[PDB]
């Protein structure tokens, strides 16, 4: 493909973290450009899987989804090269910020950006399956982008059944996923509600102190997290709409983005 790069076009500079693989800060030499590089650890994740992740990322083009720049797929070790985001993941960012700078209007701006990305995936027949603040990245001037290594192809809106034995992040996971391993764009909507709660609390852990093995049983009986201190009523109403028991009663991402755009532009 046009995406293929020579391995010697990039040089590694720093390690950022690991694992199923490692992520490096590197340099694209001809352009003197700082980039991010994801590598495949041998032998953790299967190879065809990794390569398919790259294939899918080739079709993605949106200001709030992390942009692919090139791949190395001819020989091991394999690389996926993307744009570099200066300020790391959104969870640590919220936990460590100056709240006088990162104020209410900024929180609205962040939600608007993320929902724009999800509206795009909704139109293009993709699902994410691990939406959470830990998987969003931050740049200068409160720019936010969603990481997209785990996208799956799925017509809007059919259902994907996860593999037997899979383990989920329980406090972000929709009830139909917890009980029957079923995922759709509506389970992405549920998880988005939890992400909004993360943003409103500047990165607190959800359902504090509540034993994981009882979460499902509470959701069945209509327990939901309470309205956070300082959270606007309309935003909380949006949260609660995202957490309706029946998937078809939950709003679409186009509606959610419309609502946040209006709130942002009115503030």
C-alpha atoms as an extended CHARMM CRD file, in Angstrom:
* protein
*
       267  EXT
         1         1  UNK       CA              0.0000000000        0.0000000000        0.0000000000  PROA      1               0.0000000000
         2         2  UNK       CA              0.8530000000        3.7020000000       -0.0470000000  PROA      2               0.0000000000
         3         3  UNK       CA              1.0130000000        3.4630000000        3.7520000000  PROA      3               0.0000000000
         4         4  UNK       CA              4.0930000000        1.2140000000        3.8450000000  PROA      4               0.0000000000
         5         5  UNK       CA              7.2310000000        2.7750000000        5.3540000000  PROA      5               0.0000000000
         6         6  UNK       CA             10.8440000000        1.6730000000        5.3900000000  PROA      6               0.0000000000
         7         7  UNK       CA             11.9100000000        0.7270000000        8.9400000000  PROA      7               0.0000000000
         8         8  UNK       CA             14.9360000000        3.0290000000        8.7750000000  PROA      8               0.0000000000
         9         9  UNK       CA             12.7280000000        6.0780000000        8.1360000000  PROA      9               0.0000000000
        10        10  UNK       CA             12.0030000000        6.2340000000       11.8750000000  PROA      10              0.0000000000
        11        11  UNK       CA             14.3340000000        6.4480000000       14.8760000000  PROA      11              0.0000000000
        12        12  UNK       CA             13.1840000000        5.7180000000       18.4480000000  PROA      12              0.0000000000
        13        13  UNK       CA             13.7370000000        8.3830000000       21.1070000000  PROA      13              0.0000000000
        14        14  UNK       CA             11.9320000000        7.5290000000       24.3720000000  PROA      14              0.0000000000
        15        15  UNK       CA              9.8280000000        4.7020000000       25.8220000000  PROA      15              0.0000000000
        16        16  UNK       CA              6.3870000000        5.8690000000       26.9880000000  PROA      16              0.0000000000
        17        17  UNK       CA              4.9680000000        2.6260000000       28.3740000000  PROA      17              0.0000000000
        18        18  UNK       CA              4.0150000000       -0.9980000000       27.8090000000  PROA      18              0.0000000000
        19        19  UNK       CA              1.6340000000       -5.2390000000       27.8860000000  PROA      19              0.0000000000
        20        20  UNK       CA              1.0530000000       -6.9470000000       24.5110000000  PROA      20              0.0000000000
        21        21  UNK       CA              3.5490000000       -4.4340000000       23.1190000000  PROA      21              0.0000000000
        22        22  UNK       CA              5.3050000000       -1.1260000000       23.6980000000  PROA      22              0.0000000000
        23        23  UNK       CA              4.6600000000        2.5100000000       22.7680000000  PROA      23              0.0000000000
        24        24  UNK       CA              7.5800000000        4.7700000000       21.8220000000  PROA      24              0.0000000000
        25        25  UNK       CA              8.0720000000        8.4520000000       21.1420000000  PROA      25              0.0000000000
        26        26  UNK       CA             10.0190000000        8.5680000000       17.8690000000  PROA      26              0.0000000000
        27        27  UNK       CA             11.1760000000       10.7960000000       15.0000000000  PROA      27              0.0000000000
        28        28  UNK       CA             10.2290000000       10.6890000000       11.3120000000  PROA      28              0.0000000000
        29        29  UNK       CA             13.6190000000       11.7850000000       10.0110000000  PROA      29              0.0000000000
        30        30  UNK       CA             12.8890000000       13.3290000000        6.6010000000  PROA      30              0.0000000000
        31        31  UNK       CA             10.2810000000       15.6590000000        8.1310000000  PROA      31              0.0000000000
        32        32  UNK       CA             12.0110000000       16.1080000000       11.5100000000  PROA      32              0.0000000000
        33        33  UNK       CA              8.6390000000       15.1900000000       12.9810000000  PROA      33              0.0000000000
        34        34  UNK       CA              7.8560000000       13.7020000000       16.4090000000  PROA      34              0.0000000000
        35        35  UNK       CA              5.5300000000       10.6680000000       16.1020000000  PROA      35              0.0000000000
        36        36  UNK       CA              4.1480000000        7.7750000000       18.1980000000  PROA      36              0.0000000000
        37        37  UNK       CA              5.1010000000        4.1600000000       17.4230000000  PROA      37              0.0000000000
        38        38  UNK       CA              3.2370000000        1.0540000000       18.5930000000  PROA      38              0.0000000000
        39        39  UNK       CA              5.1400000000       -2.2390000000       18.4230000000  PROA      39              0.0000000000
        40        40  UNK       CA              4.0310000000       -5.8790000000       18.6150000000  PROA      40              0.0000000000
        41        41  UNK       CA              5.5830000000       -7.8950000000       21.4490000000  PROA      41              0.0000000000
        42        42  UNK       CA              6.5810000000      -11.4430000000       20.4890000000  PROA      42              0.0000000000
        43        43  UNK       CA              4.7710000000      -13.4150000000       21.3350000000  PROA      43              0.0000000000
        44        44  UNK       CA              1.6840000000      -11.8520000000       22.9240000000  PROA      44              0.0000000000
        45        45  UNK       CA             -1.0980000000      -10.7430000000       20.5560000000  PROA      45              0.0000000000
        46        46  UNK       CA             -1.5190000000      -12.7540000000       17.3380000000  PROA      46              0.0000000000
        47        47  UNK       CA             -0.0740000000      -11.1340000000       14.1860000000  PROA      47              0.0000000000
        48        48  UNK       CA             -3.0430000000      -11.1590000000       11.7770000000  PROA      48              0.0000000000
        49        49  UNK       CA             -5.0230000000       -9.3610000000       14.4950000000  PROA      49              0.0000000000
        50        50  UNK       CA             -2.4350000000       -6.5510000000       14.7430000000  PROA      50              0.0000000000
        51        51  UNK       CA             -2.2900000000       -6.2040000000       10.9550000000  PROA      51              0.0000000000
        52        52  UNK       CA             -6.0990000000       -5.9730000000       10.7960000000  PROA      52              0.0000000000
        53        53  UNK       CA             -6.0530000000       -3.1550000000       13.3790000000  PROA      53              0.0000000000
        54        54  UNK       CA             -3.7740000000       -1.2530000000       10.9990000000  PROA      54              0.0000000000
        55        55  UNK       CA             -6.0130000000       -2.0370000000        7.9930000000  PROA      55              0.0000000000
        56        56  UNK       CA             -9.0440000000       -0.6090000000        9.7750000000  PROA      56              0.0000000000
        57        57  UNK       CA             -7.1680000000        2.5270000000       10.9030000000  PROA      57              0.0000000000
        58        58  UNK       CA             -6.3760000000        3.2760000000        7.2460000000  PROA      58              0.0000000000
        59        59  UNK       CA            -10.0750000000        4.1450000000        6.6230000000  PROA      59              0.0000000000
        60        60  UNK       CA            -10.3960000000        6.6040000000        9.5270000000  PROA      60              0.0000000000
        61        61  UNK       CA            -10.2480000000       10.3850000000        8.9460000000  PROA      61              0.0000000000
        62        62  UNK       CA            -11.5710000000       12.8080000000       11.6080000000  PROA      62              0.0000000000
        63        63  UNK       CA            -10.1660000000       15.7190000000       13.6960000000  PROA      63              0.0000000000
        64        64  UNK       CA            -10.9460000000       13.9510000000       17.0040000000  PROA      64              0.0000000000
        65        65  UNK       CA             -9.6890000000       10.4390000000       16.1820000000  PROA      65              0.0000000000
        66        66  UNK       CA             -5.9490000000        9.6820000000       16.3650000000  PROA      66              0.0000000000
        67        67  UNK       CA             -4.4910000000        9.8720000000       12.8280000000  PROA      67              0.0000000000
        68        68  UNK       CA             -2.5350000000        7.0030000000       11.2280000000  PROA      68              0.0000000000
        69        69  UNK       CA              0.6530000000        8.0650000000        9.4010000000  PROA      69              0.0000000000
        70        70  UNK       CA              2.1970000000        4.7800000000        8.1960000000  PROA      70              0.0000000000
        71        71  UNK       CA              2.9750000000        1.1090000000        8.8620000000  PROA      71              0.0000000000
        72        72  UNK       CA              5.8350000000       -1.4120000000        8.7060000000  PROA      72              0.0000000000
        73        73  UNK       CA              4.4120000000       -4.8240000000        7.7890000000  PROA      73              0.0000000000
        74        74  UNK       CA              7.0700000000       -6.5740000000        5.6850000000  PROA      74              0.0000000000
        75        75  UNK       CA              9.1280000000       -8.1350000000        8.4800000000  PROA      75              0.0000000000
        76        76  UNK       CA              9.2300000000       -8.3990000000       12.3000000000  PROA      76              0.0000000000
        77        77  UNK       CA              9.0880000000       -6.4160000000       14.4270000000  PROA      77              0.0000000000
        78        78  UNK       CA              5.9170000000       -4.7630000000       13.1130000000  PROA      78              0.0000000000
        79        79  UNK       CA              5.1620000000       -1.0440000000       13.6460000000  PROA      79              0.0000000000
        80        80  UNK       CA              2.0980000000        1.1900000000       13.5980000000  PROA      80              0.0000000000
        81        81  UNK       CA              3.0190000000        4.9020000000       13.3880000000  PROA      81              0.0000000000
        82        82  UNK       CA              0.5760000000        7.6900000000       14.3990000000  PROA      82              0.0000000000
        83        83  UNK       CA              0.5030000000       11.3900000000       15.3220000000  PROA      83              0.0000000000
        84        84  UNK       CA              1.9110000000       12.3270000000       18.7460000000  PROA      84              0.0000000000
        85        85  UNK       CA             -0.2530000000       13.9280000000       21.4800000000  PROA      85              0.0000000000
        86        86  UNK       CA              1.8210000000       15.9940000000       23.9380000000  PROA      86              0.0000000000
        87        87  UNK       CA             -0.1600000000       15.7210000000       27.2040000000  PROA      87              0.0000000000
        88        88  UNK       CA             -0.8960000000       11.9680000000       27.4640000000  PROA      88              0.0000000000
        89        89  UNK       CA             -4.1570000000       10.3380000000       28.6000000000  PROA      89              0.0000000000
        90        90  UNK       CA             -7.2030000000       12.3300000000       29.7590000000  PROA      90              0.0000000000
        91        91  UNK       CA             -7.6380000000       10.5850000000       33.1550000000  PROA      91              0.0000000000
        92        92  UNK       CA             -4.2490000000       11.6440000000       34.5540000000  PROA      92              0.0000000000
        93        93  UNK       CA             -4.7000000000       15.0420000000       32.8560000000  PROA      93              0.0000000000
        94        94  UNK       CA             -7.9590000000       15.7260000000       34.7100000000  PROA      94              0.0000000000
        95        95  UNK       CA             -6.5550000000       14.4370000000       38.0000000000  PROA      95              0.0000000000
        96        96  UNK       CA             -3.4950000000       16.7290000000       37.8360000000  PROA      96              0.0000000000
        97        97  UNK       CA             -4.8590000000       19.9670000000       36.2890000000  PROA      97              0.0000000000
        98        98  UNK       CA             -5.3390000000       23.5780000000       37.4290000000  PROA      98              0.0000000000
        99        99  UNK       CA             -9.1410000000       23.6010000000       37.8340000000  PROA      99              0.0000000000
       100       100  UNK       CA             -9.3040000000       27.4070000000       37.4700000000  PROA      100             0.0000000000
       101       101  UNK       CA             -7.9930000000       26.9070000000       33.9190000000  PROA      101             0.0000000000
       102       102  UNK       CA             -9.7930000000       23.6130000000       33.1860000000  PROA      102             0.0000000000
       103       103  UNK       CA            -13.2390000000       24.9710000000       34.1560000000  PROA      103             0.0000000000
       104       104  UNK       CA            -16.9070000000       24.2780000000       33.2820000000  PROA      104             0.0000000000
       105       105  UNK       CA            -16.8040000000       25.5910000000       29.7000000000  PROA      105             0.0000000000
       106       106  UNK       CA            -13.6730000000       23.4860000000       29.0630000000  PROA      106             0.0000000000
       107       107  UNK       CA            -15.4480000000       20.3510000000       30.3640000000  PROA      107             0.0000000000
       108       108  UNK       CA            -18.2910000000       21.0490000000       27.9140000000  PROA      108             0.0000000000
       109       109  UNK       CA            -15.7370000000       21.5390000000       25.0830000000  PROA      109             0.0000000000
       110       110  UNK       CA            -14.1520000000       18.1450000000       25.8500000000  PROA      110             0.0000000000
       111       111  UNK       CA            -17.5160000000       16.3390000000       25.8000000000  PROA      111             0.0000000000
       112       112  UNK       CA            -18.4200000000       18.0160000000       22.4820000000  PROA      112             0.0000000000
       113       113  UNK       CA            -15.1670000000       16.8170000000       20.8760000000  PROA      113             0.0000000000
       114       114  UNK       CA            -15.5260000000       13.1970000000       22.0280000000  PROA      114             0.0000000000
       115       115  UNK       CA            -19.1730000000       12.9910000000       20.9440000000  PROA      115             0.0000000000
       116       116  UNK       CA            -18.2090000000       14.3580000000       17.5120000000  PROA      116             0.0000000000
       117       117  UNK       CA            -15.8050000000       11.4310000000       17.0850000000  PROA      117             0.0000000000
       118       118  UNK       CA            -18.4460000000        8.9040000000       18.1860000000  PROA      118             0.0000000000
       119       119  UNK       CA            -21.0380000000       10.3950000000       15.7850000000  PROA      119             0.0000000000
       120       120  UNK       CA            -18.5000000000        9.8370000000       12.9960000000  PROA      120             0.0000000000
       121       121  UNK       CA            -17.9860000000        6.1530000000       13.9390000000  PROA      121             0.0000000000
       122       122  UNK       CA            -21.7770000000        5.7770000000       14.1820000000  PROA      122             0.0000000000
       123       123  UNK       CA            -22.2120000000        6.9520000000       10.5820000000  PROA      123             0.0000000000
       124       124  UNK       CA            -19.3630000000        4.7400000000        9.2690000000  PROA      124             0.0000000000
       125       125  UNK       CA            -20.5700000000        1.4370000000       10.8180000000  PROA      125             0.0000000000
       126       126  UNK       CA            -17.8220000000        1.0160000000       13.4600000000  PROA      126             0.0000000000
       127       127  UNK       CA            -17.9210000000        0.3190000000       17.2200000000  PROA      127             0.0000000000
       128       128  UNK       CA            -15.1910000000        1.1170000000       19.7930000000  PROA      128             0.0000000000
       129       129  UNK       CA            -15.8620000000       -1.3020000000       22.7140000000  PROA      129             0.0000000000
       130       130  UNK       CA            -13.5110000000        0.3000000000       25.2810000000  PROA      130             0.0000000000
       131       131  UNK       CA            -14.5560000000        3.9330000000       25.6420000000  PROA      131             0.0000000000
       132       132  UNK       CA            -13.1360000000        5.4450000000       28.8520000000  PROA      132             0.0000000000
       133       133  UNK       CA            -11.0510000000        8.4550000000       29.9030000000  PROA      133             0.0000000000
       134       134  UNK       CA             -7.8780000000        6.3150000000       30.0400000000  PROA      134             0.0000000000
       135       135  UNK       CA             -8.2680000000        5.7950000000       26.2710000000  PROA      135             0.0000000000
       136       136  UNK       CA             -8.5630000000        9.4490000000       25.2550000000  PROA      136             0.0000000000
       137       137  UNK       CA             -5.4970000000       11.6180000000       24.5240000000  PROA      137             0.0000000000
       138       138  UNK       CA             -4.9020000000       15.3600000000       25.1020000000  PROA      138             0.0000000000
       139       139  UNK       CA             -2.9930000000       17.9740000000       23.0780000000  PROA      139             0.0000000000
       140       140  UNK       CA             -2.3630000000       21.7340000000       23.3790000000  PROA      140             0.0000000000
       141       141  UNK       CA             -5.2900000000       24.0710000000       24.2020000000  PROA      141             0.0000000000
       142       142  UNK       CA             -7.5270000000       21.2560000000       25.5020000000  PROA      142             0.0000000000
       143       143  UNK       CA             -7.6660000000       19.4000000000       22.1780000000  PROA      143             0.0000000000
       144       144  UNK       CA             -8.9950000000       15.8530000000       22.7560000000  PROA      144             0.0000000000
       145       145  UNK       CA             -8.7930000000       12.7630000000       20.4860000000  PROA      145             0.0000000000
       146       146  UNK       CA            -10.0540000000        9.1660000000       20.8850000000  PROA      146             0.0000000000
       147       147  UNK       CA             -7.5730000000        6.2820000000       20.5010000000  PROA      147             0.0000000000
       148       148  UNK       CA             -8.7790000000        3.7440000000       17.9340000000  PROA      148             0.0000000000
       149       149  UNK       CA             -6.6610000000        0.5640000000       17.9010000000  PROA      149             0.0000000000
       150       150  UNK       CA             -9.6200000000       -1.6090000000       18.8750000000  PROA      150             0.0000000000
       151       151  UNK       CA            -12.2720000000       -0.6570000000       16.3020000000  PROA      151             0.0000000000
       152       152  UNK       CA            -14.5280000000       -3.3820000000       14.9080000000  PROA      152             0.0000000000
       153       153  UNK       CA            -16.5920000000       -3.4390000000       11.7190000000  PROA      153             0.0000000000
       154       154  UNK       CA            -20.3120000000       -3.7320000000       12.4540000000  PROA      154             0.0000000000
       155       155  UNK       CA            -23.3340000000       -2.4360000000       10.5470000000  PROA      155             0.0000000000
       156       156  UNK       CA            -25.3220000000        0.1720000000       12.4960000000  PROA      156             0.0000000000
       157       157  UNK       CA            -26.9040000000       -1.3530000000       14.3040000000  PROA      157             0.0000000000
       158       158  UNK       CA            -26.3190000000       -5.1010000000       14.4550000000  PROA      158             0.0000000000
       159       159  UNK       CA            -24.8160000000       -7.0170000000       17.3850000000  PROA      159             0.0000000000
       160       160  UNK       CA            -21.2860000000       -8.4080000000       17.9490000000  PROA      160             0.0000000000
       161       161  UNK       CA            -20.9710000000      -11.4030000000       20.3070000000  PROA      161             0.0000000000
       162       162  UNK       CA            -17.6550000000      -11.4010000000       22.2180000000  PROA      162             0.0000000000
       163       163  UNK       CA            -15.4900000000      -14.5280000000       22.4890000000  PROA      163             0.0000000000
       164       164  UNK       CA            -16.0610000000      -17.0620000000       25.2650000000  PROA      164             0.0000000000
       165       165  UNK       CA            -13.9670000000      -16.3060000000       28.3440000000  PROA      165             0.0000000000
       166       166  UNK       CA            -13.5200000000      -12.5920000000       27.6620000000  PROA      166             0.0000000000
       167       167  UNK       CA            -13.0670000000      -10.2400000000       30.6360000000  PROA      167             0.0000000000
       168       168  UNK       CA            -14.6310000000       -6.7600000000       30.6430000000  PROA      168             0.0000000000
       169       169  UNK       CA            -13.9930000000       -3.4720000000       32.5050000000  PROA      169             0.0000000000
       170       170  UNK       CA            -17.0970000000       -4.0170000000       34.6180000000  PROA      170             0.0000000000
       171       171  UNK       CA            -17.9220000000       -0.4580000000       35.7260000000  PROA      171             0.0000000000
       172       172  UNK       CA            -17.9400000000        0.8290000000       32.1060000000  PROA      172             0.0000000000
       173       173  UNK       CA            -19.8420000000       -2.1420000000       30.6200000000  PROA      173             0.0000000000
       174       174  UNK       CA            -23.5330000000       -2.2260000000       29.5480000000  PROA      174             0.0000000000
       175       175  UNK       CA            -25.9090000000       -4.8000000000       31.1540000000  PROA      175             0.0000000000
       176       176  UNK       CA            -26.5360000000       -6.7780000000       27.9250000000  PROA      176             0.0000000000
       177       177  UNK       CA            -22.7550000000       -7.0760000000       27.5030000000  PROA      177             0.0000000000
       178       178  UNK       CA            -22.3090000000       -8.2490000000       31.1100000000  PROA      178             0.0000000000
       179       179  UNK       CA            -25.0910000000      -10.8430000000       30.8520000000  PROA      179             0.0000000000
       180       180  UNK       CA            -24.8770000000      -12.0970000000       27.2460000000  PROA      180             0.0000000000
       181       181  UNK       CA            -21.5460000000      -10.8330000000       25.8220000000  PROA      181             0.0000000000
       182       182  UNK       CA            -23.5150000000       -8.6800000000       23.3390000000  PROA      182             0.0000000000
       183       183  UNK       CA            -22.1160000000       -5.3350000000       22.0710000000  PROA      183             0.0000000000
       184       184  UNK       CA            -23.4850000000       -2.6120000000       19.7610000000  PROA      184             0.0000000000
       185       185  UNK       CA            -23.3270000000        1.1670000000       19.1900000000  PROA      185             0.0000000000
       186       186  UNK       CA            -25.7920000000        1.4500000000       22.1250000000  PROA      186             0.0000000000
       187       187  UNK       CA            -23.3280000000       -0.1950000000       24.5460000000  PROA      187             0.0000000000
       188       188  UNK       CA            -20.8470000000        2.4620000000       23.3540000000  PROA      188             0.0000000000
       189       189  UNK       CA            -23.5320000000        5.0120000000       24.3500000000  PROA      189             0.0000000000
       190       190  UNK       CA            -23.7400000000        3.4890000000       27.8690000000  PROA      190             0.0000000000
       191       191  UNK       CA            -19.9510000000        3.6680000000       28.2610000000  PROA      191             0.0000000000
       192       192  UNK       CA            -20.0360000000        7.2900000000       27.0290000000  PROA      192             0.0000000000
       193       193  UNK       CA            -22.3580000000        8.0950000000       29.9400000000  PROA      193             0.0000000000
       194       194  UNK       CA            -19.7760000000        6.6890000000       32.3380000000  PROA      194             0.0000000000
       195       195  UNK       CA            -17.0600000000        8.7990000000       30.6320000000  PROA      195             0.0000000000
       196       196  UNK       CA            -19.1670000000       11.9500000000       31.1550000000  PROA      196             0.0000000000
       197       197  UNK       CA            -19.2820000000       11.0650000000       34.8540000000  PROA      197             0.0000000000
       198       198  UNK       CA            -15.4600000000       10.7210000000       34.8570000000  PROA      198             0.0000000000
       199       199  UNK       CA            -15.1600000000       14.1960000000       33.3190000000  PROA      199             0.0000000000
       200       200  UNK       CA            -17.5900000000       15.8090000000       35.7890000000  PROA      200             0.0000000000
       201       201  UNK       CA            -15.6440000000       14.4920000000       38.8130000000  PROA      201             0.0000000000
       202       202  UNK       CA            -12.1940000000       15.3250000000       37.3850000000  PROA      202             0.0000000000
       203       203  UNK       CA            -11.3200000000       11.6320000000       37.2030000000  PROA      203             0.0000000000
       204       204  UNK       CA            -12.8240000000        9.8700000000       40.2260000000  PROA      204             0.0000000000
       205       205  UNK       CA            -13.3000000000        6.0820000000       40.0470000000  PROA      205             0.0000000000
       206       206  UNK       CA            -16.9370000000        5.1350000000       39.2540000000  PROA      206             0.0000000000
       207       207  UNK       CA            -19.2900000000        3.3900000000       41.7580000000  PROA      207             0.0000000000
       208       208  UNK       CA            -16.8640000000        4.1140000000       44.6310000000  PROA      208             0.0000000000
       209       209  UNK       CA            -16.4040000000        1.2620000000       47.1140000000  PROA      209             0.0000000000
       210       210  UNK       CA            -19.0170000000       -0.9410000000       45.4490000000  PROA      210             0.0000000000
       211       211  UNK       CA            -18.0680000000       -4.6250000000       45.0790000000  PROA      211             0.0000000000
       212       212  UNK       CA            -17.6840000000       -5.5590000000       41.3970000000  PROA      212             0.0000000000
       213       213  UNK       CA            -19.5980000000       -8.8470000000       41.6450000000  PROA      213             0.0000000000
       214       214  UNK       CA            -22.7490000000       -6.9750000000       42.7320000000  PROA      214             0.0000000000
       215       215  UNK       CA            -22.7240000000       -4.2250000000       40.0660000000  PROA      215             0.0000000000
       216       216  UNK       CA            -25.0210000000       -6.0930000000       37.6480000000  PROA      216             0.0000000000
       217       217  UNK       CA            -27.5010000000       -6.9460000000       40.4010000000  PROA      217             0.0000000000
       218       218  UNK       CA            -27.7720000000       -3.2680000000       41.3210000000  PROA      218             0.0000000000
       219       219  UNK       CA            -28.3100000000       -2.1580000000       37.7140000000  PROA      219             0.0000000000
       220       220  UNK       CA            -31.2080000000       -4.6390000000       37.4010000000  PROA      220             0.0000000000
       221       221  UNK       CA            -32.9910000000       -2.9150000000       40.3000000000  PROA      221             0.0000000000
       222       222  UNK       CA            -32.5320000000        0.5800000000       38.7880000000  PROA      222             0.0000000000
       223       223  UNK       CA            -29.5880000000        1.8020000000       40.8760000000  PROA      223             0.0000000000
       224       224  UNK       CA            -27.4850000000        4.4760000000       39.1150000000  PROA      224             0.0000000000
       225       225  UNK       CA            -24.6360000000        6.7950000000       40.2040000000  PROA      225             0.0000000000
       226       226  UNK       CA            -25.7770000000       10.0670000000       41.7970000000  PROA      226             0.0000000000
       227       227  UNK       CA            -25.3930000000       13.5610000000       40.3370000000  PROA      227             0.0000000000
       228       228  UNK       CA            -21.8260000000       14.8110000000       40.9770000000  PROA      228             0.0000000000
       229       229  UNK       CA            -21.0800000000       18.0140000000       42.9020000000  PROA      229             0.0000000000
       230       230  UNK       CA            -21.1620000000       20.9810000000       40.5120000000  PROA      230             0.0000000000
       231       231  UNK       CA            -22.6700000000       19.0450000000       37.5820000000  PROA      231             0.0000000000
       232       232  UNK       CA            -25.3530000000       20.8970000000       35.5300000000  PROA      232             0.0000000000
       233       233  UNK       CA            -28.8350000000       19.3050000000       35.5590000000  PROA      233             0.0000000000
       234       234  UNK       CA            -29.1440000000       18.9380000000       31.7610000000  PROA      234             0.0000000000
       235       235  UNK       CA            -25.8080000000       17.1160000000       31.6100000000  PROA      235             0.0000000000
       236       236  UNK       CA            -26.9040000000       14.6900000000       34.3570000000  PROA      236             0.0000000000
       237       237  UNK       CA            -30.1770000000       14.1050000000       32.4880000000  PROA      237             0.0000000000
       238       238  UNK       CA            -28.0570000000       13.1970000000       29.4560000000  PROA      238             0.0000000000
       239       239  UNK       CA            -26.0450000000       10.7540000000       31.6150000000  PROA      239             0.0000000000
       240       240  UNK       CA            -29.1990000000        9.0690000000       32.8780000000  PROA      240             0.0000000000
       241       241  UNK       CA            -30.5560000000        8.8370000000       29.3130000000  PROA      241             0.0000000000
       242       242  UNK       CA            -27.3510000000        7.0150000000       28.3340000000  PROA      242             0.0000000000
       243       243  UNK       CA            -27.9870000000        4.4730000000       31.1270000000  PROA      243             0.0000000000
       244       244  UNK       CA            -31.5130000000        3.2760000000       30.1620000000  PROA      244             0.0000000000
       245       245  UNK       CA            -31.9050000000       -0.4990000000       30.6430000000  PROA      245             0.0000000000
       246       246  UNK       CA            -33.2840000000       -1.1200000000       27.1330000000  PROA      246             0.0000000000
       247       247  UNK       CA            -30.6190000000       -0.3710000000       24.4390000000  PROA      247             0.0000000000
       248       248  UNK       CA            -33.1740000000        1.0060000000       21.9520000000  PROA      248             0.0000000000
       249       249  UNK       CA            -34.3390000000        3.6300000000       24.4850000000  PROA      249             0.0000000000
       250       250  UNK       CA            -30.8340000000        5.1940000000       24.5840000000  PROA      250             0.0000000000
       251       251  UNK       CA            -30.1870000000        8.2870000000       22.3660000000  PROA      251             0.0000000000
       252       252  UNK       CA            -27.9630000000        8.2260000000       19.2430000000  PROA      252             0.0000000000
       253       253  UNK       CA            -24.5640000000        9.9300000000       19.0770000000  PROA      253             0.0000000000
       254       254  UNK       CA            -25.9070000000       12.4930000000       16.5550000000  PROA      254             0.0000000000
       255       255  UNK       CA            -28.4780000000       13.6550000000       19.1380000000  PROA      255             0.0000000000
       256       256  UNK       CA            -25.9280000000       13.7080000000       21.9720000000  PROA      256             0.0000000000
       257       257  UNK       CA            -23.4880000000       15.7790000000       19.9040000000  PROA      257             0.0000000000
       258       258  UNK       CA            -26.2520000000       18.1960000000       18.8830000000  PROA      258             0.0000000000
       259       259  UNK       CA            -27.1080000000       18.7490000000       22.5620000000  PROA      259             0.0000000000
       260       260  UNK       CA            -23.5200000000       19.3640000000       23.6690000000  PROA      260             0.0000000000
       261       261  UNK       CA            -22.8340000000       21.6650000000       20.6920000000  PROA      261             0.0000000000
       262       262  UNK       CA            -25.8410000000       23.7790000000       21.6910000000  PROA      262             0.0000000000
       263       263  UNK       CA            -24.7700000000       23.9270000000       25.3510000000  PROA      263             0.0000000000
       264       264  UNK       CA            -21.1630000000       24.8380000000       24.4440000000  PROA      264             0.0000000000
       265       265  UNK       CA            -22.1810000000       27.5440000000       21.9810000000  PROA      265             0.0000000000
       266       266  UNK       CA            -24.6520000000       28.9860000000       24.5050000000  PROA      266             0.0000000000
       267       267  UNK       CA            -22.0920000000       29.2950000000       27.3210000000  PROA      267             0.0000000000
